[PDB]
DNA sequence: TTTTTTTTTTTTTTTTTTTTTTTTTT
DNA sequence: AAAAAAAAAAAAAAAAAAAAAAAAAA
């Protein structure tokens, strides 16, 4: 039951991608560019950052993301619409 | 396919949640997650308020020994003990306020809603200055906003008038009549909802008979008939025998359906009830035989009956006339492959940290399945159960077995976890509700997957 | 440098462990892991039996509300509630038995070993048939096997014979003298060890005044002098009580001065204050004195004093003659930027599930760090602490603060958890101990982290 | 129709009694 | 090896306070 999840690495990679892109990024593109090891435990961290930094979280419209786990199969996630950017959360401790 | 399942729950000015809020619940079970000190317990207290006649708030934090918060604290939204001074900076809403709650059930087309509106008038805070009104409806076009608008237009006169000016709603200003109507609707037992409230934070068992005599079983004592017979100056015993036979008949079927689950790698549980005889019955039989052989000896029999009807709070006389007290309960562990008893037990005394939790969970879910369907007609009309701080003192396999046990009986469940055990949850769950708090205000987000 | 630390611990026929077993503990913190119901709590109980005068077995299971085991059960090694029959199949060792445990502490160029031997003689289970003998060693050639060898070829006389010819060995047949010698050796307050046992499983705070009036502070009541003066057939009693109160206040000032460096939630720390309240029978006694000064009626004072002395377990007597019951205690939170109260608390009622744990752990470790040697200046001579079911209810963030504060106070710790958490422990500890059960036997394995990683 | 008065129930807190174990003396 | 004094923990009972529901008066 080792390894599990590494929070610091995920935060650093998210920050690097955000500063590289330079434009607002929704959850779908962020997941597509940086696929997660675990489908859950990842969306939760991103939503926590979005709510903490103060970015509005729209809930009237939906975005669809399709993923495949290690043992084949398929999963369809009905995530809400969130727009992340580097400027808003560039100076908040974690 | 005739069971009501929770689907939604709404809030307004409750606890730390200011303004309108919502949350959705999947038919396959959900799981609320969030950091420490976020607001998970508040959301479930809001639900518990609508069901039990005398709730126990914040039960799970202390392990099942005490309660801390009260109703008037939630309405005004107290955050911490504060300090001295006069501004009372630790109270959010001061002066006139208004609050609302709701909850929705759906089985097949049919739909019901539960409600409550509470408000103040001035700057007082005594529990006697808090107006209340309870609602129950089964028609659309009646949402939280409708009630709030009606209340703002007038007062309690405007609210209570909706019944004559509509169809499908029923206001109740007294909580007792409300709960009586609710219990008659679902055909559950007398204390089913109190048991449901207790099951949310109990992680320790002390005696099975206490639970089976206080909550699970109903009251059918023969005090009235005995008093009538005594004052008349015997079918009573046959009546008592019939009532004690029914209990055995129900326990047989309960054991049969519990047999299918493995409490351990190759072992399963079983409930065992035995009969006891007190001295009081012997005296009555002796008096009867003495009277029969005498032919005036009628004075002693009537005196004994009158004494029994007099002190109805002593185990000497209570065990004479109350069929619930003629039995003794305990559990035993039986393994397959040549069924053979291996251990008998009457409580979780002396156990390990993780054994107590699983024993308590098994016993409580069996009791709930009994209570929610008093007779053999089956088809429960209420099918939800909640847990708080789920799997806090156990390992992976124990949690897996608990979840399997819950799924076996046919119950729809929701779990609460301080952001732990995600891998196990993802297999058996198909929704989530994330709560986050910044500053002093909280918020809700919803997800799903397939 | 100059602080003893636990390094090893051995067992023999204790609880479910049959035969001979041992485990090694690193001087930079270790962790104990293993499945549910394997034997983690048994080692802690074996350690606690050697220190406090009246242990509370299996404390952490109930959260700090009830103890549910006894010494004889461990000695004979039961394994459940049984079934009921001719042969008590649920008891491991029946008849004549023998059992020995020992724990060793180490320092820079020194070594001290503690120990105990307990044995039956026939088929009985009364607590008065469990003959006991406690030991304290200083020499390196004393070892558990030596004690068992001596016992098997003799008895109590054989064991006591070791002091006559050997060196650095002192057997005590009575636990009271053993504990007195121990406390004198470590230069430690009178109720520190019971506090250490209590801190293992406590996770709430009903009221901090009880904690300060029962455990941290000493006992310097004045009942005896009052009885002597009463039977002599007075103001000096009051002067004595006032002096005691002043000393208590100075000590509390010292503690709250110490507690500043450690950090609570960011930008905040804690400060402890106490107020003075007078009530009850003090006014009545003063009135009686001033009335008798007018003049007989000398028996009024004698009656009051005798009545107070006789009812030694009532609030009137406590508030009259016990100096530590003339104060009121509460805790406060101070913001670092400037100085201003943010919140004052007298208990832990109404909090969240995870806030109670952090509050309790913080206050308990703060008090314990002072109850040890730095009470009388200098650095602690006994630094170690044991936590059971660590981080059961808190989240990831809170555990970091708990560990950081624990390190800052200057104590070494061991953590006891199931496989629930594996990242923080790997990050902050150095060694692990793995337990396992197969049937009714249990065993121990000791490894460092790299070796397990290589698998 | 709105306000006031009364009764009944539930929970908490303090005090006293009981039992078992340990230590000491003969 | 046996008898006596002392101390710590558990259990039952009495006193008190607060909240809900029904009846009566302006
Ligand atoms: N009556 C109250 N008294 C004091 N603080 C309160 C009260 N009601 C709410 N709060 C505060 O509001 C916060 C909301 O957290 P809760 O919902 O009560 O517990 P929680 O969210 O379950 O945290 P955990 O650790 O997961 S149990 C609490 O942490 C308190 O700080
Ligand atoms: N006095 C006793 N009475 C009954 N069972 C006992 C006793 N002492 C030990 N056991 C058994 O020992 C096992 C539990 O002991 P431990 O393994 O020390 O508990 P544990 O390690 O704390 O388990 P967890 O991790 O806390 S759930 C169970 O099989 C118990 O039945
Ligand atoms: Mg909670
Ligand atoms: Mg344990």
Q: C401's torsion region: left (phi>0), alpha (psi -120 to 50) or beta?
A: alpha
Query: What is the C416 CA–ligand 2 centroid distance (Å)?
Result: 14
Which phi and psi angles does C315 have, rounded to 5°? Answer: -65, -30
Instruction: Report residue C446 as tokens.
Output: 């000791």
Asked whether the CA dihedral B61, B67, B68, B70 is positive or negative, the reply is: positive
Q: How big, in percent rounded to 5, are the helix, strand and coil portions of chain C?
A: 40, 20, 40
B chain contacts of residue A66, beta-carbon cutoff 8 Å: none
Say yes or no: CB of residue C356 within 6 Å of ligand 2. no
The number of beta carbons lying within 10 Å of the beta carbon of residue B204 is: 20
Contact at CB, B61 and C389, closer than 8 angstroms: no
**Would an 8 Å CB–CB cutoff place A51 in contact with chain B?**
yes
Task: Spell out the residues 6+ positions from residue C423 whose beta carbon is closer than 8 angstroms to its own.
Answer: A4
CB atoms within 10 A of CB C76: 20
Instruction: Report CA(C232)–C1'(D25) in Å, whole number.
Output: 30
Residues 162-201 of C with CB under 7 A from strand D: 174-176
* Locus of tokens 């304290």: C136
Q: Do the chains contact at C393 and B389, CB–CB below 8 Å?
A: yes
Residue with CA closest to ligand 1 atom 26: B36
Number of neighbouring beta carbons within 10 Å of residue B258: 20
Ligand 2 atom closest to Cα of C418? 25
Q: Does C419 touch chain B (CB under 8 A)?
A: yes
Q: How far is A59 from chain B (nearest CA, A)?
A: 8
Residue B265 near chain C (CB below 8 Å)? no
Give the N- to C-terminal CA distance of chain C in Å, as an integer.
36
**φ and ψ at residue C148, rounded to 5 degrees:** -60, -40
B160 touches chain C (CB under 8 A): no
By Cβ distance, the residue of A1, A47, A54 closest to B445 is: A47
Q: Following DSSP, what letter does each residue of B143-208 receive, concatenated? A: -HHHHHHHHHHS-HHHHHTTTTTSSSB--BSSHHHHHHHHHHHHT--TTHHHHHHHTTS----S-H
Of the candidates B216, B378, B375, B343, the residue with the CA atom closest to the CA atom of residue B270: B343
Q: Which helix (H) or strand (E) holds C247?
A: helix C235-258
**Cβ neighbours of residue B357 under 8 Å, at least 6 residues apart?**
B203, B392, B393, B394, B398
Query: How many Cβ atoms are within 10 Å of A68's Cβ, its own excluded?
Result: 11
Reported as half-sphere exposure (CB side, CA atoms, 13 A), residue C63 has a value of: 22
With an 8 Å Cβ cutoff, are B396 and C419 in contact?
A: yes
Cα-based distances in Å from B297 to B306, C269, C455: 15, 81, 88
H/E stretch holding B344 = strand B340-345
Q: Alpha-carbon distance A10 to C229, whole Å?
A: 75
Ligand 2 pocket: which of C11, C14, C40, C61 to mutate (most atoms <8 Å of CB)? C40
Cα atoms found within 13 Å of the Cα of residue B120, Cβ hemisphere only = 18
Q: How was this structure determined?
A: cryo-EM
CA of C188 to the centre of ligand 3 (A): 39
- Residue having the nearest C-alpha atom to atom 23 of ligand 2: C37
Strand blocks (E) in B187-266: none
**Partner residue opposite B436 with nearest CB, options A1, A40, A48:** A48
Tell me the HSE value of B4 on the side-chain side, using a 13 A CA sphere: 17
Is-contact C93 B355, C-beta < 8 A?
Answer: no
C12: exposed, middle or buried (Cβ count in 10 Å: 0-12, 13-18, 19+): buried
Q: How many CB pairs under 8 A join A and C?
A: 6
Residue C12 CA from chain centroid, whole number: 24
Residues 6 or more apart in contact with residue B202 via CB below 8 angstroms: B59, B64, B360, B364
Query: What is the token pair recorded at B298?
Result: 């009628």
Q: Buried (b) or exposed (e) across A6-26, using 16+ Cβ within 10 A?
A: eeeebeeebeebbeeeeeebe
Q: How far is the CA of C338 from the C1' of E5 (A)?
A: 60
Integer Cα distance of B163 and C340 in angstroms = 55
Q: For chain C, positions 81-100, list CB contacts with chain B under 8 A.
A: 81-84, 90
Nearest to B438 among A44, A52, A75 (CB): A52
What is the C392 CA–ligand 2 centroid distance (Å)? 18
Tell me the nearest-neighbour CA distance from C338 into chain A, angstroms: 22
Looking at domain B5-203+349-447, its CATH architecture is 3-Layer(aba) Sandwich (3.40)
Q: Which residues of B touch C419 (CB under 8 A)?
A: 395-396
Say yes or no for a CB contact (<8 Å) between B61 and C350.
no
Q: Is residue A50 classed as helix, strand or coil in its secondary structure?
A: helix
The neighbourhood of ligand 4, an ion, using CB within 5 A, equals B 353; C 41
Query: What is the residue extent of each domain of chain C?
Result: 5-200+371-454, 208-345
User: Which tokens sit at B211?
Assistant: 């639970």
Residue A34 lies in a domain: yes
| Nearest protein residue by Cα to C1' of nucleotide E8 | C54
Please count the structural domains in chain A: 1
Name the resolution in angstroms.
Answer: 3.3
Restricting to C residues 290-349, those with a Cβ less than 8 Å away from any Cβ of B are 341-345, 349
Nearest to C204 by CA among B162, B352, B381, B61: B61
Cα C264 to Cα B440, C15, C257, C369: the distances in Å are 20, 40, 15, 16
Dihedral over Cα of B349, B354, B355, B361: its sign: positive
C-alpha–C-alpha distance, residues C146 and B173, integer Å? 80
The C-alpha atoms of residue A43 and residue B141 are separated, in whole angstroms, by: 36
Task: Answer whether A76 sits within 8 Å of B35, measured CB to CB.
Answer: no
CATH homologous superfamily of C5-200+371-454: P-loop containing nucleotide triphosphate hydrolases (3.40.50.300)
Name the residue closest to the C1' of D16 by its CA.
C313
């Amino acid at each position: 039951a080792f390894d599990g999840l590494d929070r610091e690495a995920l935060i650093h990679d998210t920050l690097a991608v955000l500063v590289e892109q330079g434009r607002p990024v929704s959850l779908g593109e962020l997941a597509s560019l940086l696929p997660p090891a675990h489908d859950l435990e990842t969306f939760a961290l991103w939503l926590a950052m979005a709510r903490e930094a103060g970015i509005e979280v729209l809930t009237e419209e939906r975005q669809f993301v399709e993923l495949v786990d290690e043992d084949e199969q398929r999963w369809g996630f009905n995530l809400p619409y969130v727009g992340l950017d580097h400027e808003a959360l560039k100076d908040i401790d974690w | 396919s005739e069971t009501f399942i929770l689907t939604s729950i709404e809030l307004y000015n409750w606890g730390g949640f200011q303004g309108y809020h919502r949350a959705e619940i999947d038919p396959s079970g959900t799981a609320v997650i969030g950091p420490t000190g976020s607001g998970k317990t508040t959301l479930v207290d809001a639900l518990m308020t609508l069901l039990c006649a005398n709730p126990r708030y914040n039960l799970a934090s202390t392990g099942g020994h005490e309660s801390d918060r009260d109703l008037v604290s939630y309405v005004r939204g107290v955050t911490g003990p504060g300090d001295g001074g006069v501004e009372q900076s630790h109270i959010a809403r001061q002066g006139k306020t208004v609050t609302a709650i709701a909850a929705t059930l759906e089985r097949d087309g049919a739909q019901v809603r539960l409600g409550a509106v509470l408000w103040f008038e001035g700057t007082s805070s005594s529990a006697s200055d808090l107006k209340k009104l309870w609602l129950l409806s089964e028609s659309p076009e009646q949402t939280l906003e409708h009630w709030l608008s009606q209340h703002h237009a007038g007062g309690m006169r405007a609210l209570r008038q909706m019944e004559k000016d509509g169809m499908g709603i029923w206001p109740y200003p007294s909580k007792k009549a409300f709960l009586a109507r609710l219990r008659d609707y679902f055909e559950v037992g007398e204390n089913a909802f109190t048991l449901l409230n207790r099951a949310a934070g109990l992680k320790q068992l002390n005696s099975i008979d206490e639970i089976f005599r206080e909550l699970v079983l109903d009251d059918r004592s023969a005090f009235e008939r005995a008093a009538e017979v005594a004052s008349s100056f015997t079918q009573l015993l046959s009546y008592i025998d019939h009532e004690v036979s029914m209990i055995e008949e129900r326990l047989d079927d309960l054991n049969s359906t519990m047999q299918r689950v493995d409490f351990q790698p190759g072992r399963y549980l079983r409930l065992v009830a035995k009969k006891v005889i007190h001295e009081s019955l012997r005296t009555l039989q002796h008096a009867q035989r003495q009277l029969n052989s005498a032919r005036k000896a009628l004075q002693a029999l009537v005196g004994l009956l009158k004494d029994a009807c007099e002190h109805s709070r002593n185990q000497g006389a209570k065990a004479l006339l109350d069929p619930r007290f003629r039995l003794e309960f305990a559990v035993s562990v039986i393994d397959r492959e040549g069924n053979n008893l291996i251990e008998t037990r009457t409580g979780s005394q002396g156990g390990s940290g993780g054994e107590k939790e699983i024993i308590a969970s098994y016993v409580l879910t069996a009791s709930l399945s009994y209570a929610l369907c008093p007779d053999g007609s089956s088809r429960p009309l209420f099918g939800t159960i909640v847990l708080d701080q789920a799997f806090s003192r156990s390992s992976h396999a124990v949690a897996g077995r608990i979840i399997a046990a819950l799924r076996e009986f046919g119950l729809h469940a929701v779990f609460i976890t301080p952001n732990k055990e995600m891998r196990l949850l993802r297999h058996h769950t198909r929704s989530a509700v994330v709560v986050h708090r910044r500053g002093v205000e909280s918020s809700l987000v919803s997800l799903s997957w397939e």
